[PDB]
Design a protein around this ligand. Sequence first.
Ligand SMILES: CC(C)C[C@H](NC(=O)[C@@H](O)[C@H](N)Cc1ccccc1)C(=O)O
Ligand SMILES: Clc1ccc2[nH]ccc2c1
Ligand SMILES: [Yb+3]
Ligand SMILES: [Yb+3]
Ligand SMILES: [Yb+3]
Ligand SMILES: [Zn+2]
Length: 607
Amino acid sequence: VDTCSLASPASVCRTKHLHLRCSVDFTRRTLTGTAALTVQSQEDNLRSLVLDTKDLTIEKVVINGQEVKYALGERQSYKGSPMEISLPIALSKNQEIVIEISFETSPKSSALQWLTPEQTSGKEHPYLFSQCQAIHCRAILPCQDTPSVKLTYTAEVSVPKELVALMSAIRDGETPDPEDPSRKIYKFIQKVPIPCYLIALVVGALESRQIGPRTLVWSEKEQVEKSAYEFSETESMLKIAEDLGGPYVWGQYDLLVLPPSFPYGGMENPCLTFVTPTLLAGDKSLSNVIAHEISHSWTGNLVTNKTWDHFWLNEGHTVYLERHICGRLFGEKFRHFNALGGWGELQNSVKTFGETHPFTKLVVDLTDIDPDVAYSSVPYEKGFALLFYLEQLLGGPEIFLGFLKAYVEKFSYKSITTDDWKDFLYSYFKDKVDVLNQVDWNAWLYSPGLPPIKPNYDMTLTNACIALSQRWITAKEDDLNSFNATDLKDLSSHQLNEFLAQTLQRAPLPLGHIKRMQEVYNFNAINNSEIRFRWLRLCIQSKWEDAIPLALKMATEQGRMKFTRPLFKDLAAFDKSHDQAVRTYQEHKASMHPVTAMLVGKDLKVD
Ligand SMILES: CC(C)C[C@H](NC(=O)[C@@H](O)[C@H](N)Cc1ccccc1)C(=O)O
Ligand SMILES: Clc1ccc2[nH]ccc2c1
Ligand SMILES: [Yb+3]
Ligand SMILES: [Yb+3]
Ligand SMILES: [Yb+3]
Ligand SMILES: [Zn+2]
């Protein structure tokens, strides 16, 4: 039972295919067109079915060439409004029909951000991008909006001719629009069945550059060069992910670098991963994000969580592969460094929510909860820690990766639950069930708070970071003089980041300490987004008025929620910046991503 969806569940009917024909209208900020669902009944004598929608205007519904009856129920908040459709003829089990719905979206569709020319790089053309995960697909097109259903799709998309459309699919060519020569139609085919949350569209002044045998980077012209360099390790990451997961089945692996308001670091849209431009650090240092989205091509897009209650299946196994890619690429010690940091992000989230909070459970009950409100690192790092703990328990990485590969083959193209996963783990490791029965399943899967067991981590790359952070925290005023630029001589940008996270955990420090840190380390100059983010947090929580404009500027000039949310929150909790924080949010809110706008609004207690 998918408690985030109002649609008929997969036991009743399932969508096998979507043919989308639509037109992007920048003047009205609407998508208008038809969604033709090929629907297979799962039941005898089926006479109606129910679809998810959200802020969609339905024009008509056509089956066997006739307008048919349908009704929209009362809006149920962030779930949207169910659409009941009356079939003209009862369907037997396994029978397929095609249902063609004429629809138009709202400019406030929570799946979409419409950008004015001034909000892009070029300054002449507008831009549109989608984000359907978790349950915003219903705000683009009526559908069974649940990952328990997988479908193929094909689409034809008409856009102003000087713009380009891309989707989560293989590009199938372009032509002038026969109905209007001011337009081009772009075609797309996704031959591999997918959950609808992986449906994606961008329309913009896009250009592409080739960076490996199956990868082109796409962005606006002014980001292309820099992105081709930043993401140059992409092919080699695919080669390793294929070795760990089995064949890459999706044809293409492209990258789209979005405008700065993209709400995520990355989004594993099939054939076309979307990434934040805040990845462009100039040194490839943030590439683990690519490794992570690549990994979804197996864990997530092939084997999918059946409902969002089981999200950790998606994310934990994906972080687990991500960290294996990075460990192959850079050495086992680096995998362990990133693993430990991830445990540290886990400590932060549990501390923030509170150790008994329901959202700190690995498996969560999302009835009545908006998945955007519940979203945190918990399913990522608690899930990763589980797998990392089982890895050590069952004989090491090589052995656990043999399980990961077999799990992918086993559930390829399916949607699965935590029990489906646990069963296969027991089956695969039958010769080691004795060890498996020593796991505290009830605590690991269903209890709030930190996991009951913390794995073993190599400390090698981490020590220098913990040591500098401890010098800073235990320093008194008469110790500040001994800090020098050379303290950082031997730290990678990742160690500098981990140095800041250690220190941010004990924040505030005295203002004097922070000022000296700027004096000797000149963190203000660093443009790596992760480092700068943590440094501005350390500054604002330690109450340094000079950082108020730097924090306001970062919070609004990009919209990656990981950064923009805690920055606004910190700013709001600092009395000197509180008023400018709420003022700034209120000035920017209209032209913000609607999901970010909503979440920043709640974090600020505004509206
Ligand atoms: C290395 C990763 C932790 C990077 C991370 N990206 C992801 O987790 C993506 O694969 C997720 N699919 C992002 C997501 C999750 C839920 C709803 C909407 C979007 C991010 O920060 O965006
Ligand atoms: Cl969307 C989403 C799905 C599953 C989850 N489990 C814990 C948080 C959470 C959020
Ligand atoms: Yb073709
Ligand atoms: Yb079993
Ligand atoms: Yb002293
Ligand atoms: Zn992910």
